Design an enzyme around this catalytic site. Structure first.
Site, mmCIF file in Angstrom:
data_model
loop_
_atom_site.group_PDB
_atom_site.id
_atom_site.type_symbol
_atom_site.label_atom_id
_atom_site.label_comp_id
_atom_site.label_asym_id
_atom_site.label_seq_id
_atom_site.Cartn_x
_atom_site.Cartn_y
_atom_site.Cartn_z
ATOM 1 C CD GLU A 38 34.218 131.239 84.632
ATOM 2 O OE1 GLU A 38 33.244 131.277 85.418
ATOM 3 O OE2 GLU A 38 34.368 132.039 83.689
ATOM 4 C CG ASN A 86 24.041 132.650 84.952
ATOM 5 O OD1 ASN A 86 25.049 132.946 85.598
ATOM 6 N ND2 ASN A 86 24.029 131.673 84.048
ATOM 7 C CG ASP A 132 27.275 130.028 84.504
ATOM 8 O OD1 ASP A 132 26.503 129.972 83.520
ATOM 9 O OD2 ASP A 132 27.889 131.067 84.826
ATOM 10 C CG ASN A 152 24.823 130.224 80.795
ATOM 11 O OD1 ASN A 152 23.769 129.715 81.152
ATOM 12 N ND2 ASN A 152 24.987 131.545 80.720
ATOM 13 C CG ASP A 202 29.819 129.554 69.331
ATOM 14 O OD1 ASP A 202 29.346 128.759 68.491
ATOM 15 O OD2 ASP A 202 29.160 130.495 69.815
#
Length: 129
Positions: free
Chosen positions: A35, A46, A52, A59, A101
């Site tokens: 990353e 993005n 990000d 994000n 999540d």
């Protein structure tokens, strides 16, 4: 800050990421490698206008506020700039929310494409932890 591999592993362990949601420390280090190349200051725009931020490229579409992502949420309740700090606490706290999540570490596309299913233990090999 640009972390060393074992240095980051240690910092992640210190902040309770090791085996968080069943993801071993090597998974987290691998994700950070691809990353951000371990650089806490990494930012990337993005196509859709979100950005990000930080060591785990969190994000602004969902997780932090940068004031320039129309429609977006701030589910970690933090300014996106907080995710660029030398101290990884804010990024770790938010990553814990993200990985809980529903889709686990698949939230990090680079983790899915470059870490998932690989010998992730190599990322902590030789580290005094």
């Amino acid at each position: 800050k640009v972390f060393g591999r074992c240095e980051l592993a240690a910092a992640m362990k210190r902040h309770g990421l090791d085996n968080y949601r069943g993801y071993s420390l090597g998974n987290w280090v691998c994700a950070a490698k691809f990353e951000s190349n371990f650089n806490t200051q990494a930012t990337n725009r993005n196509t859709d206008g979100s950005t990000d931020y930080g060591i785990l490229q969190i994000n602004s579409r969902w997780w932090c506020n940068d004031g320039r992502t129309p429609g977006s949420r701030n589910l970690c309740n933090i300014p996106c700039s907080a995710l660029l700090s030398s101290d990884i606490t804010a990024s770790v706290n938010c990553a814990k929310k993200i990985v809980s999540d529903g889709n686990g570490m698949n939230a990090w596309v680079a983790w899915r494409n470059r870490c998932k299913g690989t010998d992730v233990q190599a990322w902590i090999r030789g580290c005094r932890l």
